[PDB]
Design an enzyme around this catalytic site. Structure first.
Site, mmCIF file in Angstrom:
data_model
loop_
_atom_site.group_PDB
_atom_site.id
_atom_site.type_symbol
_atom_site.label_atom_id
_atom_site.label_comp_id
_atom_site.label_asym_id
_atom_site.label_seq_id
_atom_site.Cartn_x
_atom_site.Cartn_y
_atom_site.Cartn_z
ATOM 1 C CB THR A 13 47.510 24.954 47.511
ATOM 2 O OG1 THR A 13 48.007 26.283 47.718
ATOM 3 C CG2 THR A 13 48.198 24.026 48.478
ATOM 4 C CG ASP A 58 50.341 33.115 42.582
ATOM 5 O OD1 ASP A 58 49.246 33.123 43.201
ATOM 6 O OD2 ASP A 58 51.437 33.385 43.120
ATOM 7 C CB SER A 60 47.900 36.620 44.548
ATOM 8 O OG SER A 60 49.104 35.902 44.435
ATOM 9 C CG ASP A 91 45.524 34.635 47.794
ATOM 10 O OD1 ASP A 91 45.050 34.297 48.904
ATOM 11 O OD2 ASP A 91 46.720 34.962 47.642
ATOM 12 C CB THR A 161 33.441 37.715 49.906
ATOM 13 O OG1 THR A 161 34.619 38.530 50.032
ATOM 14 C CG2 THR A 161 32.777 37.496 51.308
ATOM 15 C CB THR A 270 27.018 48.478 52.951
ATOM 16 O OG1 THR A 270 27.257 48.603 54.366
ATOM 17 C CG2 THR A 270 26.826 47.013 52.603
ATOM 18 C CD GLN A 271 32.956 51.818 55.422
ATOM 19 O OE1 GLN A 271 33.000 51.673 56.645
ATOM 20 N NE2 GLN A 271 33.143 53.003 54.825
#
Lengths: 331, 331
Positions: A13, A58, A60, A91, A161, A270-271
């Site tokens: 963008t 892009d 993504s 993204d 992240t 790990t989550q």
């Protein structure tokens, strides 16, 4: 004007134009706009050269072939410039940063990935702030790593992240301090030491790799996990509970062990948002190795990096556990 | 002494004893300890009754059969008590809370899930604080929902996720304010309204369901995704980029569309820590539905809930998108 920075406008963008039906890409718009913004041309700012990708990418839709294109671009321009700013959509910005960190071995000039929520040309846009500061930082506060710049902070790329996106954009590095704070007064956080260069820049080849990334949950079945590990899968990242726990269930453990017995690399993350896997448990007995405190982005791109070279599964398992580029903390 | 609270000790460090080789479960220890701690027996505290599960349940080994056992226990004891505290290990506490929220329809008494990093009996343990305050809150500040209590905060259960575990434990509800702050002065956050009861408590049956939970990444292939969707999979949760974007790649989209065409429910969640999916895109064209701002825990348990009833795939897709128990925000 002294320092000279290369700006690769890959997509995002940041360089777009507003329209009745969304922001849209327009060739040459970013350069045309910057020509008219005198703050970019003050004596305190570096000279810069813009290379707009054609077509724009892009984020993504990014693939590892695109990671390679960016690494190649940096490599062919490496000696010509003092640093590099990569403009990128938000993204998958953290995936690209992480991938570049593994590909660009012995990096000895700064590489800053950045972008924005609002195009550069709008009034009050983060696009204008992010490009201006990435340029200034690359020239005057060089950190010789692949870093990611956003919301006034310079993160280690392979520790980042995407933290939020709905209504506004934000990044985080949950398991490491920022490299530098870019407020009114720029403050390097010198307790975060950069990886050392052991020679000339080496730019590695990465290709797409068949990797499963999956999440453990109560009662997850052997049949489901079996399917995750079918050909052509070469590696699996498990996201497990807390410090790396999974159900003590023969159905699950046998599938993972059979996979490792046939060369599949199985990595435990790990989550949890932050913190480290700490693993003898039955998962270790089943051949699963610790991903420590790696982000999914770092683990996924590191597996691409290692699978893309001439390494045995055992060699890969050992290197996945070593800190290669500052992406993990091991005690 | 007036109010009466049922405490289900399902498992978890909170009730364990320390040993030379770790914390260990000991039958009856929690009750024996509490008998000797007069703060639990002050006039200001409710009476309470402890039911210790036998065997204790290791939360990382939890299955939906265990969710059902806990729901059943609450249901058989529902009229006898004014509220319910479930003591639980931290690893999957957020999954259990989320599952119970769907199973316990028209809940009109408080159900608080809690636990700790350190056993109750240690000096300075969070176990002692967490049990003491869950008891006090259930009796004196009842919130008629399944909630989760940790680090002095009462979260909506189906909005929680485990935020950290290495070296210390912590929970978060990234997309909703806490229900209540339990510091020195207890403060209900009344802008978070509880789901209303439309009649008598209804306790639903849930059984294990074959669900894939997977993460999208650059270049992820059709072959890999194909394997995720093989029988016996009934549903797939995708974790995609930013506000719900995935690669515009026919290979990927065709696999998802073929799955939806045969009745598989495919749900899009974001990889971001917070924020909402906002989806016409090609994913919608492929039959994928929005999970909005649901946690993985809420989506996974909600799919178990809906797949366990007599619902068509289309009925499931519609209900996945509706706010049933306060687990999602839709504009």
């Amino acid at each position: 004007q002294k320092k000279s920075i290369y700006v690769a406008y890959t997509g995002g963008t940041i360089g777009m134009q507003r329209s009745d039906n969304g922001y849209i890409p327009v060739s040459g718009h970013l350069q045309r706009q910057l020509a008219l913004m005198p703050e970019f041309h003050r004596p305190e700012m570096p000279d810069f050269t813009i290379h707009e990708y054609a077509p724009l990418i892009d984020s993504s839709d990014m693939t590892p072939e695109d990671w390679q294109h960016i690494a190649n671009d940096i490599q062919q321009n490496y000696d010509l410039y003092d640093g590099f700013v990569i403009l990128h959509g938000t993204d998958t910005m953290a995936f690209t940063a992480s991938a570049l960190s593994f590909m660009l071995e012995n990096l000895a000039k700064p590489v800053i990935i950045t972008g924005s929520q609002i195009p550069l040309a709008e009034l009050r846009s983060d696009g204008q702030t992010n490009l201006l500061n990435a340029l200034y930082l690359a020239a005057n506060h060089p950190v010789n790593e692949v870093s990611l710049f956003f919301n006034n902070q310079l993160f280690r790329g392979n520790r980042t992240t995407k933290a939020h996106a709905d209504g506004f954009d934000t990044f985080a590095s949950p398991n490491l301090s920022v490299l530098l704070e870019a407020g009114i007064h720029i403050r390097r956080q010198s307790s975060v030491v950069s990886p050392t260069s052991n020679g000339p820049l080496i730019v590695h080849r990465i290709t797409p790799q068949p990797i499963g990334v999956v999440t453990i949950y109560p009662g997850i079945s052997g049949a489901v996990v079996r399917n995750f590990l079918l050909q052509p899968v070469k590696a699996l990242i498990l996201r497990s509970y807390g410090v790396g726990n999974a159900p003590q269930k023969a159905e699950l453990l046998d599938e993972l062990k059979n996979a490792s017995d046939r060369g599949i690399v199985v990595v435990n993350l790990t989550q949890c948002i932050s913190g480290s896997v700490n693993m003898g448990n039955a998962l270790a007995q089943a051949g699963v190795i610790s991903g420590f405190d790696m982000t999914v982005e770092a683990a996924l791109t590191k597996l691409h990096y290692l699978l893309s070279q001439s390494l045995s599964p055992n060699e890969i398992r050992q290197l996945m556990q070593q800190n290669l580029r500052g992406e993990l903390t091991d005690t």
